[PDB]
Amino acid sequence: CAEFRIKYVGAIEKLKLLEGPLDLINYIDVAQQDGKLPFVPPEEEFIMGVSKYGIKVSTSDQYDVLHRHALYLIIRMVCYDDGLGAGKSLLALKTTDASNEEYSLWVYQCNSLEQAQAICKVLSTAFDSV
């Protein structure tokens, strides 16, 4: 269980039917090219909490929850360098719905690679305990 300050790039929601971490990265690269997602997030920071329950993203004053990504519904999360030349680290989360009929992609940008990796480690430990 841990909290991190992150920025929010955006989401591609309600996709139907990306098996492979490389495929997800490529999918998002192309989505950015096609204007579905920004390349660079707005500067506004959010609080990302990671735990056994999943990932929660809240405003920086904790007054409002933006996203709740429950562990049950997380399919995979990929951490990667955005490739834009500044070494920024992204987290791309693939999630599904209660019936596992639709998928959504959520993309965040971390302050540092150390933090992105820390986030992944908590998530991986979370799955381990199941």
């Binding site: 990929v78 951490c79 990667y80």
Partner: peptide, 19 residues
């Protein structure tokens, strides 16, 4: 444009429930 995904990937985490 940007380098290949292989050159950029750091780690991935998979939910075994859907694997």
């Amino acid at each position: 444009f940007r380098p290949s995904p292989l050159e950029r990937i750091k780690t991935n985490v998979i939910n075994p429930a859907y694997a």
